[PDB]
Amino acid sequence: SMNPPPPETSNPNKPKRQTNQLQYLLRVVLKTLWKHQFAWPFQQPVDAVKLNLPDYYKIIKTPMDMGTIKKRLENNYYWNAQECIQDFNTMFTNCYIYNKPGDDIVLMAEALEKLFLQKINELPTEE
């Protein structure tokens, strides 16, 4: 079994900025989710080899996780908030696509997503 390379967190010819919205996504959104009791399965890419999920990366073709998002935010990888918000939504969607309703991992994703939605509701206006 083999894992794919992780999503990129560095790319010098990708345009990027530091905006107040992106600062909020790190300081408030990422930090809130990262500290949650249910964050741990989402803190790094899915290790399909160790978890014995040989079909994971057949089904999930756009993987995303908070470890990647954290590095992207710390490395100022993004151009805008929308890009980062998309990464979070991809992470949650992947979980719901791969797993069954009521599964522990789905309940965990749902708890994190609720908080994500609460925080993103107060995304500040662009300065």
Ligand SMILES: Cc1nnc2n1-c1ccccc1C(c1ccccc1)=N[C@H]2NC(=O)OCc1ccccc1
């Ligand atoms: C993130 C994410 N998205 N899906 C899955 N994780 C995940 C990522 C990383 C780690 C665990 C998980 C858990 C999980 C997490 C918490 C509780 C239940 C399940 N479940 C994984 N899914 C699955 O079928 O694992 C079977 C399995 C589960 C565990 C071991 C072997 C085989």
